[PDB]
Amino acid sequence: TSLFTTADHYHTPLGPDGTPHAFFEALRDEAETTPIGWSEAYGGHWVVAGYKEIQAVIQNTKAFSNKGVTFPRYFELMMAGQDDPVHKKYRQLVAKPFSPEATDLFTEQLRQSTNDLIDARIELGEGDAATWLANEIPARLTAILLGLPPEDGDTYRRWVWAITHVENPEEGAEIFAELVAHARTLIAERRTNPGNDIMSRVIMSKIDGESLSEDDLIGFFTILLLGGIDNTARFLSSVFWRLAWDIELRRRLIAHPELIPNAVDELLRFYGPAMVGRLVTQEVTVGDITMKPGQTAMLWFPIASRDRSAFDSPDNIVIERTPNRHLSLGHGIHRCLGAHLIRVEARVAITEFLKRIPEFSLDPNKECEWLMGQVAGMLHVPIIFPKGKRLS
Ligand code: HEM
Ligand SMILES: [Cl-]
């Protein structure tokens, strides 16, 4: 028997600790023999698990297409769901607006908003770190980047959750219509009165004589919400969970805050939420396997992140690991636009949380829960801590 035959990113067996990592470790071991396997799930598809094999797929932009990023398919994501030439036109237009120098101007606002969120429950001595913090931080960050009051993020959070959970397509269309109406109002304001926020920057961007249309700008807003918020939330939730029980990791980050950036990269390797599809467009051989047009290949980044040929001691969080060429933020032409942003955001989140609440643990009377799928990680992380004080 092979673990590939029933591999299913929405149904990953969970271990006693609550995560899929025992299963991932077992699949990584099998991938040393069979780095690309056939799963019978979703009508049949390739599971690409070896690090070299994922790299070979993801570097191939001739035989694979990002029209297949979402799988199963039951609307185009700007850049993430597109191929060249349109992908490249959009990426060039947003490159400088979303540069590290530009997004770094928002760091101190992010730090303030993170402390404001912590204030909400610090006096209570309990909370769900995923619902209270991890889900809220990226949504408030989005609002901050757009020049809006941070609490406007609460609406973004609600939309993203609703869009991804409603069963009725008419209801889904109503929610998406709210989101689009907001984007149009924001765009009109930023066009008439440009500022220094990311939307103003994207509006003014011009490349080879051309600018983004209103539809393209709505698309950009949409991918910030639908491509950024859940990935970040699930990653941060997993990190908060790990810090709640891993007292040795925790004490080291408190004693050596200069190690937090390298630790963020190591936590990305270990808890990276994403698994992404590719549609096969031309016949192509990768290793021992020949893929055929119309098939789907799923890139199981978490397995590649544990490949012993790529990482020594892959099952350990070695916070000093460097370099760290993990695939959790992709690789090549679709590499995460948010890659710098989320590294800074995770540093701030960890730093402020451990500064405000250095003593905490998982709540023994409530359950954690791991969310499976293409964006995976802890969904509920109930913690307890000694009651503390609001900064405001
Ligand atoms: C921890 C949080 C995040 C993770 C793990 C993550 C992961 C990824 C991965 C793996 C890819 C490559 C997809 C592929 O190869 O098809 C990607 C692409 C992308 N991400 Fe992120 N992401 C995160 C946060 C964000 C945020 C906050 C933004 C907002 C800017 C963002 C925007 C994008 C966009 C626009 C792309 C497509 C880029 C392109 O196609 O050129 N992501 N992300
Ligand atoms: Cl910091």
Swiss-Prot record:
Residues annotated for substrate binding in this entry: 231
Other facts noted in the record for this chain: It lacks the conserved threonine believed to be involved in dioxygen activation and instead contains an asparagine at position 242. It is the first isolated P450 using the flavoprotein cindoxin (CinC) as its natural redox partner.
UniProt pathway: Terpene metabolism; 1,8-cineol degradation
Organism: Citrobacter braakii
Highest taxon listed in the record's lineage: Bacteria
Positions bearing the site annotation: Controls regioselective substrate oxidation: 231
Protein's name according to its UniProt entry: 1,8-cineole 2-endo-monooxygenase
An individual GO BP term: carbazole catabolic process
